[PDB]
């Protein structure tokens, strides 16, 4: 029931095209509001609110600190990038694709084809449905990209359809860990 | 392309501190404050990199000191509670008698304080459960994962109970075969 008081700081390193373009951000929060901020595109602290003006001015008076922050894109961002490059930037985990039917309403027939794509990394994924070699773009609902919190992702891409005997449905998956599209078929 | 975040916070009066490293939404490691030891999200990370926990403990002292300054300068304005959004799901499709893992995703909340309890048929579970620290978001809020490895059966139902100061009643998200 007592009041809470939170101090929260983030030091962000943003990488584009490997380490060719690197951006460094420092952010200071109290409770829910950002007050001070260092942006490598500026090279100085700036006040986000009037509450953070004393810290920005005082910090901008310390030349030794501004030089540390201005060099972070190299001494901090690019350094830490190379430390874990082998098991983060280059981490690759193949997807596990399975198809199984389901039902929109318990008392109705199987009118829902689920394409489960789980256990992959990174989060990038593209899934497509096909009826008899033609792509089905209408009637597709999905959970979206689900982060499992353990360096793996999953997603369900479902197709609302009435399967007819003889028809073949194909779930096609594209992921940076595989070269050619991955296909799984389901026959009625 | 890629983002690396170093997130640290200190909370009063709970006196809770955290220091962690993020890579595109995932945890590389966090510094255990009591043990003063670098905990890697995946054991294999420790074999490829390192980090001296003393740097984190040093930052947490500064953050603790800055909190006192900002609490005074802000005239002791308390934080506004933001209740969490809770989701329960499984690591993979569910096959009977085939091991799996229930995942409770607590999302979009502040301050970073939550009690999370796994319930099997209403009874608490305190064996086999694991949990991550508070993870950063793009919008100054926090998220958190809890895990319950289980053997799927038709006789067992599960509930993830979450309690947050921004919640009137504790949240219960359900899951069953």
């Amino acid at each position: 029931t007592r009041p809470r008081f939170l101090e929260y700081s983030t030091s962000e390193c943003h990488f584009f095209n490997g380490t060719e373009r690197v951006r460094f951000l420092e952010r200071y929060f109290h409770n829910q509001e950002e007050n001070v901020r260092f942006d490598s595109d500026v090279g100085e602290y700036r006040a986000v609110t009037e509450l953070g003006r004393p810290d920005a001015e005082y910090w901008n008076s310390q030349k030794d600190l501004l030089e540390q922050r201005r060099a972070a894109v190299d001494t901090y961002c690019r350094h830490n990038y190379g430390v874990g490059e082998s098991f983060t930037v280059q981490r690759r985990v193949h997807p596990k694709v399975t198809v199984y039917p389901s039902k929109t309403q318990p008392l109705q027939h199987h009118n829902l084809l689920v394409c489960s794509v789980s256990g992959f990394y990174p989060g990038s994924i593209e899934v497509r449905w096909f009826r008899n070699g033609q792509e089905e773009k209408t009637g597709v609902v999905s959970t979206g990209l689900i982060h499992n919190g353990d360096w793996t992702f999953q997603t369900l891409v479902m197709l609302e359809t009435v399967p007819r005997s003889g028809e073949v449905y194909t779930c096609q998956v594209e992921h940076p860990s595989v070269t050619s599209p991955l296909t799984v078929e389901w026959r009625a | 392309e890629h983002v690396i975040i170093q997130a640290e916070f200190y909370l009063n009066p709970d006196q809770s501190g955290e220091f962690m490293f993020d890579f595109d939404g995932d945890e590389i490691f966090h510094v255990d404050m009591a043990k003063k030891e670098t905990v890697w999200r995946l054991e294999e990370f420790g074999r490829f990199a390192s980090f001296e926990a003393q740097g984190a403990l040093a930052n947490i002292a500064v953050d603790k000191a800055n909190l006192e300054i900002m609490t005074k300068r802000s005239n002791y304005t308390p934080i506004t509670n933001v209740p969490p959004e809770v989701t329960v799901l499984t690591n993979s499709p569910v096959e009977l008698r085939e091991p799996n893992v229930l995942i409770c995703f607590i999302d979009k909340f502040t301050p970073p304080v939550v009690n999370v309890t796994w319930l099997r048929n209403g009874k608490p579970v305190t064996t086999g459960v694991s949990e991550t620290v508070f993870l950063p978001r793009e919008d100054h809020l926090f998220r958190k994962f809890h895990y319950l490895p289980f053997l799927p059966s038709t006789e067992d139902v599960y509930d993830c109970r979450v309690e947050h100061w921004g919640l009137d009643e504790p949240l219960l998200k359900h899951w069953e075969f």
Partner: peptide, 12 residues
């Protein structure tokens, strides 16, 4: 291979 912490700066 060793990670580096940014250092926290004391506020006014």
């Amino acid at each position: 291979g060793g990670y580096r912490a940014r250092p926290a700066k004391a506020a006014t």
